[PDB]
Ligand binder design. Structure first.
Ligand code: NDP
Ligand code: ZN
Lengths: 208, 125, 115, 86, 297, 460, 96
């Protein structure tokens, strides 16, 4: 491992693995998986019903005190029965550590709002609802935050087209801005960049 | 605490897609064929969903290529054919599914290149 | 089988009741919207547009979808009442600039290749 | 009233088409002997009922079902179609 | 049909409609609506102007990139007319002044300029010509306006036999001189008026362009209802919430609108005429700070 | 053969092979690969009508369709007829058949001739490659009669070459001694040789008797020579002798017919009369040319002032003789069904859209029917495919090749007429490679094919 | 080496020119059509053929790292000259 390769830290790896097993032992009702990545990032995969308990634990336990919510977001994977995965990034200042909590939902299953655990979640949840269509139960005021008023659809979904469905212009007959079906003078050029000849043998999937 | 409803899933009214881009389109679910210019097979592993090709015309200024259908560049990736069928069905798109084409196993023998009495004997190597 | 978590309604009747409440609220609001935005439409055609937008989703037989639609309609009503929308957003429901599209087979044959 | 062509859509393996298949392999030739100018098309269904299509003048068509019919029954149906009797 | 002129797209902003239109008098009231209608479906528009380009700036966003081309012209010269209409397949004449100027009287505006436009367009092989005259244009009119309108209509027909003549009554719209003029006064009972909406006239011109059978025809664009002048002005003042151009305009506004049943109208072009009661508020709301007038049918 | 069309910004750039182990494995023909150049030349873009001078001039869809519909209403019965060319899809074929049936016309013809005596097209296996392309790898003897598979069906010949190389396949040929890129046993040029093999005098009868998986392949080019009935009867007699002497080995399906054009099998499935003889017997006064460019019918074979409509995509020998031109779509510009020589139905996909005012062919026929007061029941492509299922339900199974065997019935019906053979050696039309490049209207418009013809005629 | 159309328009080095029936010509009225006067094909046609006493020559377009990728050109064929695939320069062996 000469100067072009990123150095690795075994002590942090061991510490994060130990804390992951600790968390899993404490909350076996909700934890389904624990992982530590090769660049020393710990993630915990939980059942959706445990969003409020688990987070509360990680915020209030003396051995965790993850008091900061760094980020809350969603990822859309159409091939899964539960389309959306919800990712919470937490920072602990007492122990100078970071953790990630993942759960899942589909287009019709509500997720509990975590504003009672972290005040920062409020706008984040709004953003998720705006961009993916995930509903959060018991949210103080859930509504659109990024899209235009009356905008239809959720643009961060994979099946949503890049340029959308409508475009805006000014019309002098009705003397106002109007929305019309989108027409592009130059269509966006789709590129097929992926090569054959797989790059990484370590991630090869079984040929099933 | 559980409704226990029994019905086919349909989220068409919630996706914001215009009416004529639901019941007029035809999606194709298929494993893409290997590019014959190359030998690698890594691009023939996953299932693709792609929409039907619509009109493309020439821009009167600059002669660019113009389109009016918003789904001309939309391609979705799926692990199995069943996942793609489920997605298309719940999204209200009529689909055509093509079965995966697999190269059949072949009998290869270097020794057959130099045959006593068969036609497989090569004239050069 | 196929047990699922509710959003708001345990069955179809509760969803229908929520739909009726939302429709009542929109019907009450329409004249205020017409006056306050200084629109050029009548109250009658505003309420007709509300009815049409409700009837567009009349084929749904799933309570979760129905009350998600009700949540979205309540969001739209809250946007309208608080005058967060402009006149352009309100007028977008009517497509007064879009050219009419013929549903006839011959007309679509004549105009282009689109079915 | 003028017959133009008839169509027999039978399936390869399903038992319901069995008798229909028999009719062909037993009697179709003789039928083609009696009607050398009538197109009797034989085509293949798949997981569908056996059927008989009859086309008359000006493009009018009538179809009848042949599910579980025996060779005698399909022969009688075909004679009824050819003669025009109801 | 010259492949570069074959329609393509969905009839939108970046579509191709196959129309190359030269619109004379595009900088006025009717011209802005005509150019907007032409450019929203992706036609190519050539705008001749004699005014400052600043006065033509409001037509720039009316079309896609390259679809609106501004060229300078003057009505006394035939070369500018020729270079403006060289490449068009349809020419529209909207040129007209409602008063007399020291450099252009009614004869030049309504007779000589339309005649020159028609002759040059016929020489250049323009396929379609559309000319606007007045509904009450007759040879024996007491007013020089309508008299010159009738003479110009005859000369346009002589120069361009396949020309389409569109005759309209007082046009009421947001930038008109009917409703705004009647609202700026701050006699009747014998004059009858038949006003027509501006958008109706624009759609009529567009459909006349698109109609293949409207080649040599003459149209009359009129509204649905006929009003007496006194009650019409009463309605105008009521809509504004307020208590109740040298010589030619007075004589033209005191005269009654003629009735020509034998001429095709907006309904022959597939247009339903919009009543004044639906647009009076739109036009007259800016004059502020339900009881519609009686009609004669 | 399965292909991939490469497009960019609405233009076809190239054609590549698409892998299908059963049809073309991994290869395509030079014509298939390089003839796409012809899609950019001599294209029909707008409707056309005859002016007062007699010259073809542009017009709208309304005018051309109204002129065609007026004559369709004026004439009926046997006064109306249609000819189908070699690049026509099944949707347009069934649409035209329905339109002509609604006027009580049954003269739906193709340019390629198949003998109608006996079973005719009533039994599908009577006009198919029953062994299938892959089944050649299982045969041990093959007999080629009156065909040049090298240029008529290059991938079928490649499969024969592969079986010859790897399976020690024995090959014999009846016809002219062409070069097939493999060594074969020339039995001669006379059709009477078949009779000898049918009788048992020829020693190749003993060769075929000993075979476990024998194969007899007869080309349609040998069926066009007015001996088609007698040639087909002789081949059927040979196959019946094989099955009678060697017994029933299984479902081996000895008999085979090798076709040349892509539209023939679908037309025969749908009930089109093969050949153009019905036109000669009863000349029509309204004639539909659905991409027909073989020139087998001239204005001399039709009465004076016959109304001829050409629908197609290229300007070729078929367009200048027509009164009305309706511009259609090429195979790269529509989703259309074609059935190959095996009886396997496959659909194309839209790569680009038709140029100018050209439209989908079945849509043209449907619009014409509506304008003429004879509206067809179907309005979408799905409904047209439902109609195809109603008429012949094998046209909607899009990769299936298996079918019933009615060889016994066809062989028994083929013994009724006793047409004699001609004293004329079997000479295939594709004698040498210079005759392979130009065979259809797309090939004839290709500049690359012209370069190939020039290079093979004189080389540097 | 610019040419002129039968109408009067200049023909570009790509051969572009609107035909007589094209309406798009209207974009140039009261304006100009931008045409580059130096045609690269004619300019590269005027370069002399270089003479080298080797079977294989190398070309990088001149200027070292400021040129193009370095390529090697075979000069065994006496019928024609070797041409660089980037630069267009020509090389030949000293025939006679
Ligand atoms: N009451 C109505 O509005 C109806 C209109 N009429 C006719 O309809 C036509 C258009 O109506 P409208 O839009 O309201 O009239 P406008 O006064 O609004 O504009 C007329 C156009 O003609 C141009 N124009 C006027 N004089 C000259 C000239 N001497 N040389 C060159 N161009 C000139 C003007 O351009 P610029 O500003 O640069 O001078 C202007 O763009 C006119 O011919 C009118 O007579 C038909 C029935 C009534
Ligand atoms: Zn160089």
């Amino acid at each position: 491992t000469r100067p072009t390769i990123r150095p690795r830290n075994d002590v942090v790896h061991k510490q994060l693995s130990a804390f992951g097993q600790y968390v899993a032992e404490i909350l076996p009702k909700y934890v389904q998986q624990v992982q530590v990545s090769c660049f020393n990032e710990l993630e915990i995969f939980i059942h959706p019903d445990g969003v409020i308990p688990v987070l509360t634990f990680l915020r209030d336990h003396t051995n965790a005190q993850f008091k900061s919510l760094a980020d809350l977001t969603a990822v859309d994977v159409p091939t899964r029965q539960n389309r959306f995965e919800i990712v919470y990034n937490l920072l602990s200042l007492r122990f100078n550590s970071r953790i990630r909590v993942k759960t899942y939902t589909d287009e019709l299953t509500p997720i509990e709002s975590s504003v009672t655990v972290y005040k920062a979640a409020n706008w984040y949840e709004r953003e998720i609802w705006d961009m993916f269509g995930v509903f959060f139960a018991n949210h103080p005021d859930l509504r659109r935050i990024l899209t235009d008023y009356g905008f239809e659809g959720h643009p961060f979904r994979k099946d949503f087209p890049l340029s959308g469905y409508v475009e805006l212009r000014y019309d002098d007959e009705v003397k106002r801005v109007v929305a019309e079906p989108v027409e592009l003078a130059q269509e966006f050029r789709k590129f097929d960049l992926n090569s054959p000849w797989e790059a990484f043998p370590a991630y090869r999937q079984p040929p099933e | 605490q559980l409704i226990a409803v029994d019905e086919k899933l349909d989220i068409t009214t919630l996706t914001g897609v215009p009416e004529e881009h639901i019941k007029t389109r035809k999606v194709r679910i298929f494993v893409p064929a290997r590019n014959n210019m190359q030998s690698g097979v890594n691009n023939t592993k996953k299932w693709k969903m792609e929409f039907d090709t619509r009109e493309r015309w020439e821009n009167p200024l600059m002669g660019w290529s113009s389109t009016a259908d918003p789904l001309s560049n939309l391609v979705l990736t799926f692990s199995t054919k069943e996942d793609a069928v489920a997605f298309a069905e719940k999204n209200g798109w009529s689909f055509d599914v093509e079965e995966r084409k697999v190269p059949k196993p072949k009998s290869k023998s270097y020794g057959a290149n130099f045959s006593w009495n068969k036609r497989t004997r090569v004239s050069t190597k | 089988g196929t047990s699922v978590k509710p959003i708001f309604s345990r069955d179809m009747n509760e969803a229908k009741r929520r739909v009726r409440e939302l429709y009542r609220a929109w019907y009450r609001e329409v004249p205020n919207t017409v006056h306050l935005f200084q629109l050029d439409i009548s109250v009658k055609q505003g309420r007709d547009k509300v009815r049409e937008m409700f009837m567009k989703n009349a084929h749904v037989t799933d309570p979760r979808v129905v009350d998600l639609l009700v949540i979205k309609g309540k969001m739209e009503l809250e946007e309208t009442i608080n005058v967060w929308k402009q006149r352009t957003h309100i007028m977008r429901f009517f497509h007064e600039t879009e050219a009419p599209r013929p549903t006839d087979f011959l007309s679509k044959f004549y105009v282009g290749h689109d079915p | 009233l003028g017959l133009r062509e008839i169509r027999i859509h039978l399936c390869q393996r399903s038992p319901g088409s069995q008798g229909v298949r028999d009719f062909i392999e037993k009697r179709y030739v003789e039928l083609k002997k009696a009607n050398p100018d009538l197109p009797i098309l034989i085509r293949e269904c798949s997981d569908v009922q056996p059927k008989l299509w009859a086309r008359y003048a000006f493009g009018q068509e009538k179809n009848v079902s042949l599910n579980n019919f025996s060779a005698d029954q399909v022969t009688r149906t075909l004679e009824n179609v050819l003669s025009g009797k109801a | 049909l010259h492949h570069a002129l074959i329609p393509h797209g969905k009839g939108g902003r970046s579509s191709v409609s196959g129309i190359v239109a030269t619109v004379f008098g595009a900088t006025g009231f009717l011209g802005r609506y005509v150019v907007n209608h032409l450019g929203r479906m992706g036609s190519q528009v050539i705008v001749p102007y004699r005014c400052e380009p600043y006065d033509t700036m409001h037509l720039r966003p009316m079309g896609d990139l390259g679809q609106i081309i501004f060229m300078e012209w003057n009505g006394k010269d035939k070369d500018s007319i020729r270079k403006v209409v060289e490449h068009s397949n349809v020419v529209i004449n909207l040129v007209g002044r409602e008063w007399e100027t020291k450099n252009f009287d009614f004869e030049d505006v309504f007779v000589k300029i339309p005649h020159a436009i028609a002759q040059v367009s016929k020489e250049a092989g323009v396929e379609k010509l559309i000319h606007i005259s007045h509904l009450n244009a007759d040879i024996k009119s007491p007013s020089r306006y309508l008299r010159s309108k009738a003479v110009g209509e005859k000369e346009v027909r002589a120069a361009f036999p396949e020309a389409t003549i569109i005759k309209p009554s007082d046009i009421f719209g947001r930038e008109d001189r009917f409703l705004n003029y009647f609202a700026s006064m701050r006699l009747g009972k014998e004059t009858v008026k038949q006003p027509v909406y501006i958008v109706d006239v624009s759609k009529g011109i567009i459909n006349a362009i698109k109609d293949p059978d409207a080649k040599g025809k003459t149209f009359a664009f009129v509204g649905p209802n006929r009003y007496l002048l006194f009650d019409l002005v009463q309605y105008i003042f009521a809509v504004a919430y307020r208590p109740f151009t040298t010589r030619d305009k007075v004589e033209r506004v005191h005269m009654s609108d003629m009735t020509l049943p034998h001429l095709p109208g907006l309904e022959d072009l597939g247009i339903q005429a919009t009543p004044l009661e639906l647009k009076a508020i739109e036009v007259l709301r800016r004059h502020r700070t339900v009881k519609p007038a009686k009609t004669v049918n | 053969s399965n292909i991939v069309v490469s497009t960019r910004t609405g233009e076809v750039m190239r054609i590549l092979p698409r892998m299908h182990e059963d049809i073309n494995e991994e290869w395509i023909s030079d014509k298939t690969r390089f003839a796409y150049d012809g899609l950019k030349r001599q294209r029909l873009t707008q409707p056309m009508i005859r002016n007062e001078k007699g010259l073809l001039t542009y017009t709208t869809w309304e005018d051309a369709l109204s002129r065609v519909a007026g004559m369709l209403q004026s004439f009926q019965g046997n006064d109306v007829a249609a000819i189908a060319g070699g690049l026509v899809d099944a949707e347009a074929l069934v649409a035209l058949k329905d339109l002509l049936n609604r006027v009580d016309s049954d003269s739906l013809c193709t340019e390629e001739v198949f003998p109608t005596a006996g079973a005719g097209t009533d039994l599908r296996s009577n006009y198919l490659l029953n062994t299938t392309i892959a089944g050649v790898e299982e045969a041990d003897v093959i007999l080629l009669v009156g065909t040049n598979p090298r240029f008529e069906a290059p991938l079928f010949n490649a499969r024969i070459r592969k079986s010859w190389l790897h399976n020690d396949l024995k090959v014999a040929l009846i016809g002219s001694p062409v070069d097939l890129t493999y060594r074969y046993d020339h039995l001669g040029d006379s059709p009477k040789i078949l009779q000898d093999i049918a009788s048992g005098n020829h020693p190749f009868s003993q060769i075929l008797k000993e075979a476990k998986k024998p194969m007899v392949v007869l080309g349609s080019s040998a069926l066009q020579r007015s001996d088609g009935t007698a040639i087909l009867a002789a081949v059927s007699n040979i196959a019946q002798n094989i099955r009678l002497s060697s017994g029933v080995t299984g479902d081996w399906k000895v008999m085979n017919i090798l076709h040349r054009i892509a539209s023939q099998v679908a037309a025969l499935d749908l009930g089109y009369k093969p050949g153009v003889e019905a036109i000669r017997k009863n000349p029509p006064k309204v004639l539909f040319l659905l991409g027909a460019d073989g020139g087998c019918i001239t204005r001399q074979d039709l009465p004076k002032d016959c109304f001829i409509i050409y629908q197609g995509h290229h300007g070729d020998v078929g367009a200048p003789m027509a009164d009305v031109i309706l511009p259609g779509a090429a195979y790269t510009e529509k989703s259309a069904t074609y059935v190959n020589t095996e009886g396997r139905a496959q659909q194309t996909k839209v790569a680009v859209t038709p140029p100018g005012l050209a439209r989908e062919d079945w849509k043209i026929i449907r619009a014409l029917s509506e304008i003429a007061g004879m509206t067809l029941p179907y309005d979408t492509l799905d409904q047209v495919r439902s109609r195809l299922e109603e008429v012949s339900p094998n046209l909607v199974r899009y990769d299936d090749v298996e079918g019933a065997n009615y060889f016994q019935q066809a062989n028994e019906l083929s013994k009724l007429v006793n047409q004699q053979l001609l004293a004329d050696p079997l000479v295939p039309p594709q004698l040498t490679i210079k005759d392979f490049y130009m065979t259809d209207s797309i090939s004839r418009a290709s500049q690359t094919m012209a370069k190939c013809v020039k290079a093979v005629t004189e080389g540097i | 080496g610019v040419r002129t159309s039968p109408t009067g328009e200049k023909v570009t080095h790509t051969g572009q020119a609107y035909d007589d029936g094209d309406y798009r010509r209207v974009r140039f009225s009261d304006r100009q059509k931008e045409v580059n006067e130096n045609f690269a094909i004619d300019l590269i046609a005027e370069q002399p053929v270089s003479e080298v006493g080797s079977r294989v020559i190398s070309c990088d377009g001149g200027g070292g790292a400021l040129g193009h990728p370095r390529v090697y050109i075979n000069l065994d064929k006496e019928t024609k000259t070797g041409t660089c695939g980037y630069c267009g320069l020509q090389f030949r062996q000293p025939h006679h």
